[PDB]
Amino acid sequence: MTVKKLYFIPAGRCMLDHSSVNSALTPGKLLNLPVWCYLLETEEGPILVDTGMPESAVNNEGLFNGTFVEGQILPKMTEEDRIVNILKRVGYEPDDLLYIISSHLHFDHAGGNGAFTNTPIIVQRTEYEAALHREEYMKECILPHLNYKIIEGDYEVVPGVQLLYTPGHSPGHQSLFIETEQSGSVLLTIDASYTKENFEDEVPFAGFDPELALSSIKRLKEVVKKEKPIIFFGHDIEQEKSCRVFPEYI
Numbered sequence: 001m002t003v004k005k006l007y008f009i010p011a012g013r014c015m016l017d018h019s020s021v022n023s024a025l026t027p028g029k030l031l032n033l034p035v036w037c038y039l040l041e042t043e044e045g046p047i048l049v050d051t052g053m054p055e056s057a058v059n060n061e062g063l064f065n066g067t068f069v070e071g072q073i074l075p076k077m078t079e080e081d082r083i084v085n086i087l088k089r090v091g092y093e094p095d096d097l098l099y100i101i102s103s104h105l106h107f108d109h110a111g112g113n114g115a116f117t118n119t120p121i122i123v124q125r126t127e128y129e130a131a132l133h134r135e136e137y138m139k140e141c142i143l144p145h146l147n148y149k150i151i152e153g154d155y156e157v158v159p160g161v162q163l164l165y166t167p168g169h170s171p172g173h174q175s176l177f178i179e180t181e182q183s184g185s186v187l188l189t190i191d192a193s194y195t196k197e198n199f200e201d202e203v204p205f206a207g208f209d210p211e212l213a214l215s216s217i218k219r220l221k222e223v224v225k226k227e228k229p230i231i232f233f234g235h236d237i238e239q240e241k242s243c244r245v246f247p248e249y250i
């Protein structure tokens with residue numbers, strides 16, 4: 001069984017210093033990068049991958065002033081980019097969703113999690129546990145009483161939707177391997193590679209544990225050699241130019 005539709009849904013944007021996409025570069029040039037969520041229409045119901053940025057980021061580029069990352073991360077988010085507004089425009093309310101999948105709990109992926117208080121939120125145990133104490137996590141991304149479905153390692157969500165454990169960028173980061181009716185095998189790296197060159201050329205990028213991130217890339221390359229998927233990266237300005245986005249699907 002395959003997924004019926006895989007939608008790429010723009011969920012606002014974020015400025016990052018360009019040393020975050022290539023650790024070699026000298027800081028000083030910001031890049032206006034895409035923030036994504038993905039909607040999977042399946043036999044069993046709709047599944048949302050990631051939930052955009054938090055409320056506090058709306059009309060607030062200076063959100064991280066006063067923090068260790070001041071000036072080097074600036075969210076670009078309007079009221080329209082709140083995940084409940086995105087969902088409503090597409091045609092859903094939060095309680096319609098079968099599952100939320102959190103690739104990881106960075107603020108541009110889990111900022112909207114609080115809107116889903118009934119839907120199971122599938123997240124790696126190592127990511128959940130890290131978010132409870134590491135300083136790069138926002139309180140909006142680790143709310144205590146949501147319906148977490150904590151998993152450990154690779155996991156089949158529904159037929160055609162596989163989670164691949166890809167730690168390194170964050171301690172419990174996970175990627176998606178999807179089989180769609182229209183396109184066959186699709187690999188969503190999410191932040192296991194911001195860009196094509198992080199993946200193909202193993203250019204280092206921002207992460208918790210870059211050595212681990214490299215071994216997760218190598219693991220994904222083994223999957224790619226076996227399955228030959230089309231591959232989409234997490235924060236790639238170049239690839240964004242040719243991506244099919246909502247209302248188009250793959």
Ligand SMILES: CCCCCCCCCC(=O)NCCCC(=O)O
Pocket residue numbers: 016064067069073106107108109135136137138191235
């Ligand atoms: C509470 C103050 C710190 C919160 C932000 C720390 C950012 C590092 C981790 C992070 O959120 N990176 C986002 C860039 C794209 C991504 O990697 O998701």
Ligand SMILES: [Co+2]
Pocket residue numbers: 104106169170191
């Ligand atoms: Co991230």
Ligand SMILES: [Co+2]
Pocket residue numbers: 106108109191234235
């Ligand atoms: Co990200």
